[PDB]
C-alpha cells in the first residue's frame, strides 16, 4: 500500500466536544493534503466542512445519534437527512445497544432500517457503529446480521467514547459475518501505520482515524 | 434535609449507551419509590418513561444533542420538540463547547436561543450543560452569561462523559454568575449523601444523580 492508496481507506476524523472552528479547518486542510476518503465530523460542522472541501474529492460525512445510539429513531433520521442535505455523503449511525442487549431485535432492526431507508432515498450510504466494547461476541455477530438485514452498507467497530476501540479479532469476526456484502470500518485507537495495516488485514475496508498525519507520514 | 426533600432536588438518571428496557423500568421504579423530581433519559426512552410515570408526580425529562453538544441546532430542536411532545417536561441540552472555546459567542448564543424558543413555546424548561471540565473558569462565567442571554432556565455542570463532573467551586461560581435568575444543576460524579448536600450548599437547586439509591438509603 502506497501512502496515497492508504489514504483512500481513511475517514479523517475529529469528533471531540471541544473542537473549534480552527480545529475543524485544520482537519479539512489535512484531509485535502493527503487526499483521504472523507472528513468525519459531528453534524453541526457539516456546512463548514462541505465549504472547506468544495471542489475536492474528499467527502464530508457525519455521525448521527452519536456516540450513545439512544436517540429516538425519528430524531436520528432528521439529523441524518438534514446533514445529507447540507453536504454529508455518508452517515455513521450508532446501534441501539440497549435494545440489542435487551434482545429486542425487532426494535434494533426498525431503528437501523429507518436510517437505511432515509439515507438510501437520498442516494447515500449508511454505516452502523456496533460499539464492540459493550457487546458479547454473539452480540457482535447478531448486530452485524441485523445491520445487513436492515440494509446498512457498513458495520463499524467503535465510537471512541467507550472502554475500547477496534480490535483485530473483532474486525475479523465482523468481516466473516458480513462476508463481502457490507464494508467493515475499523475505528478507535488506531495510532500507527502498522496498526492501520493490521486492521486492513483483519478485514477492514475503511478506517476512522484521528492520527492520520502521523500514520501517512 | 429529610430523604423526601433531598429526593425533590434529584433528576434520577441513567444515560448509559447499554441501558436496557429493564434498566429504564428500574430507573422509573426507583424514582417513584423515592419520589424524585424527575427521571432523566436519552430521547429514545421518553415514550416508555412517560408511560411508567403516568399518574405520578415524577417528570420525564430528556437530554438532547448529548453528550457532545455538536449536533446541528435544527436537529437538536427536532429532537427536543419530539421529546417534549412524547412526554418530556424539561430538556437538558449541551453547550456548543467548541464555539465557546473558539470565541464564536454569536454562534453559541444562536444555538441555545433556538432550543430555548422551541422548549418555551411548549411551556417547558431548558437546562444548558456547560461541561465545566472542558472550560476555563472565565469560560464557565461567560457560558453562564450566554446561557442566560439565550433564555435558558438552568445552567448545568456536566455530562459525565468528560474528565470530571460537578465541583463545589464550579457550582458556587455558576450560582454567583446567574444569581437567583436561573437554576443551577450539579451533575456528574455525585456519589454520596454528603456530596449531594455539599452541592446544595454550594448553590445547586437541582442535581443529576445516577447513584441515587445509595444516596437516599
Report the distance separating Cα A215 and Cα A196, nearest Å. Answer: 8
The alpha carbon of B53 is separated from its chain's Cα centroid by a whole number of angstroms, namely 19
SS3 content of chain B, % helix, strand, coil (to 5): 50, 15, 35
Residue B119 main-chain phi, psi, to 5 deg: -70, -45
C-alpha angle with apex B94: B180 to B85, nearest 5 degrees?
A: 90
3-state secondary structure of A110: helix
- Best mutation target among A75, A77, A143 (most B Cβ atoms within 10 Å) is A75
Closest chain B residue to the Cα of A47, Cα to Cα: B72
The alpha carbon of B124 is separated from its chain's Cα centroid by a whole number of angstroms, namely 13
Of the candidates A40, A60, A58, which has an alpha carbon nearest to the alpha carbon of residue A50? A60
3-state secondary structure of B107: helix
Closest chain A residue to the Cα of B17, Cα to Cα: A68
Q: Calculate the alpha carbon distances from B162 to A95, A103, B3, B127, B188 in Å.
A: 22, 30, 29, 18, 9
CB-CB contact of B210 with B161 (8 Å): no
Report the distance separating Cα B89 and Cα B50, nearest Å. Answer: 10
B83 is written with which cell numbers?
Answer: 421529546
Asked if the Cβ–Cβ distance from B43 to A98 is below 8 Å, we say: no
Beta-carbon contacts of residue B121 (< 8 Å; ≥ 6 apart) = none
Helix (H), strand (E), coil (C) string for A35-96? CCCEEEECHHHHHHHHHHCCCCCCEEEEECCCCCCCCCHHHHHHHHHHHHHCCCCEEEEECC
The distance of B163 to chain A (nearest Cα, Å) reads 12
The distance of A70 to chain B (nearest Cα, Å) reads 5
Assess whether B185 carries a catalytic annotation. yes
Of the candidates A158, A153, A149, A154, which has an alpha carbon nearest to the alpha carbon of residue A105? A149
Report the distance separating Cα A170 and Cα A190, nearest Å. Answer: 14
DSSP B58: P
Domain boundaries, chain B: 1-217
Return the number of CB contacts < 8 Å for A and B.
Answer: 124
CB-CB contact of B28 with B20 (8 Å): no
Give A23's contacts in chain B (Cβ within 8 Å).
98
The distance of B175 to chain A (nearest Cα, Å) reads 23
**Number of C-alpha atoms within 13 angstroms, CB side, residue A92?**
33
The distance of A4 to chain B (nearest Cα, Å) reads 31
CATH code that applies to domain B1-217 = 3.20.20.70
**Number of C-alpha atoms within 13 angstroms, CB side, residue B215?**
32
Residue A94 main-chain phi, psi, to 5 deg: -115, 135
3-state secondary structure of B66: coil
**H helices, E strands: number in chain B:** 10, 8
Is the omega angle on the peptide bond into residue B124 within 30 degrees of 0, that is, cis?
no
Is the omega angle on the peptide bond into residue A53 within 30 degrees of 0, that is, cis?
no
Asked if the Cβ–Cβ distance from B78 to A83 is below 8 Å, we say: no
The distance of A5 to chain B (nearest Cα, Å) reads 31
Assess whether A92 carries a catalytic annotation. yes
Report the distance separating Cα B160 and Cα A163, nearest Å. Answer: 14
A29 is written with which cell numbers?
Answer: 486542510
* Experimental technique: X-ray
Report the distance separating Cα B118 and Cα B124, nearest Å. Answer: 9
Closest chain B residue to the Cα of A78, Cα to Cα: B75
Resolution, Å (one decimal)? 1.8
- Per the rule left: phi > 0, alpha: psi between -120 and 50, beta: everything else, A162 is beta
Residues in chain A whose Cβ is within 8 Å of chain B: 15-24, 41-46, 66-75, 78-79, 82-83, 86, 94, 96-99, 101-102, 104, 131, 134, 161-162
- DSSP-derived secondary structure for A118-177: HHHHTT-EEEEE--GGGS-HHHHHHHHHHHHHTT-SEEE---SSSS----HHHHHHHHHH
Asked if the Cβ–Cβ distance from B67 to A68 is below 8 Å, we say: yes
- Best mutation target among A13, A18, A76, A101 (most B Cβ atoms within 10 Å) is A18
Give B98's contacts in chain A (Cβ within 8 Å).
16-21, 23-24, 44
Assess whether A170 carries a catalytic annotation. no
Asked if the Cβ–Cβ distance from B79 to A79 is below 8 Å, we say: yes
Report the distance separating Cα B108 and Cα B111, nearest Å. Answer: 5
CB-CB contact of A45 with B104 (8 Å): no
Residues in chain A: 217
A107 is written with which cell numbers?
Answer: 426494535
Report the distance separating Cα B203 and Cα B161, nearest Å. Answer: 23
CB-CB contact of A67 with B17 (8 Å): yes
Report the distance separating Cα A186 and Cα B75, nearest Å. Answer: 27
Beta-carbon contacts of residue B52 (< 8 Å; ≥ 6 apart) = B24, B25, B28, B29, B32, B39
Report the distance separating Cα B95 and Cα A66, nearest Å. Answer: 16
Asked if the Cβ–Cβ distance from A70 to B101 is below 8 Å, we say: no
Report the distance separating Cα B207 and Cα B196, nearest Å. Answer: 8
Candidate list B127, B156, B167, B170, residue with the active-site label: B156
Candidate list A11, A92, A111, A170, residue with the active-site label: A92
The CB density around residue B18, as the number of other CB atoms within 10 Å, is 18
Residue owning grid cell 432536588? B9
Closest chain A residue to the Cα of B19, Cα to Cα: A98
Report the distance separating Cα A164 and Cα A159, nearest Å. Answer: 9
B95 is written with which cell numbers?
Answer: 453547550
Burial of B211 (0-12, 13-18, 19+ CB in 10 A): middle
Amino acid at each position: 500500500l502506497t501512502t496515497e492508496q492508504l489514504a483512500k481507506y481513511i475517514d479523517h476524523t475529529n469528533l471531540k466536544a471541544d473542537a473549534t472552528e480552527a480545529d475543524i479547518k485544520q482537519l479539512c486542510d489535512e484531509a485535502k493534503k493527503f487526499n483521504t476518503a472523507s472528513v468525519c465530523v459531528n453534524s453541526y460542522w457539516i456546512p463548514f466542512v462541505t465549504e472547506q472541501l468544495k471542489g475536492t474529492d474528499v467527502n464530508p460525512i457525519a455521525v448521527v445519534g452519536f456516540p450513545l445510539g439512544a436517540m429516538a429513531t425519528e430524531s436520528e433520521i432528521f439529523e441524518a437527512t438534514t446533514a445529507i442535505d447540507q453536504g454529508a455523503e455518508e452517515i455513521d449511525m450508532v446501534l441501539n445497544v440497549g435494545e440489542l442487549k435487551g434482545g429486542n431485535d425487532e426494535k434494533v432492526l426498525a431503528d437501523i432500517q429507518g436510517l437505511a431507508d432515509a439515507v438510501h432515498a437520498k442516494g447515500k450510504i449508511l454505516k452502523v457503529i456496533l460499539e464492540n466494547a459493550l457487546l458479547t461476541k454473539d452480540e457482535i455477530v447478531r448486530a452485524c446480521q441485523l445491520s445487513e438485514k436492515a440494509g446498512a452498507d457498513f458495520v463499524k467497530t467503535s465510537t471512541g467514547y467507550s472502554t475500547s476501540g477496534a480490535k483485530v479479532e473483532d474486525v475479523k469476526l465482523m468481516r466473516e459475518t458480513v462476508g463481502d456484502r457490507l464494508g467493515v470500518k475499523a475505528s478507535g485507537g488506531i495510532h500507527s501505520r502498522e496498526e492501520a495495516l493490521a486492521m486492513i488485514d483483519a478485514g477492514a475496508s475503511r478506517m476512522g482515524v484521528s492520527a492520520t498525519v502521523a500514520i501517512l507520514t
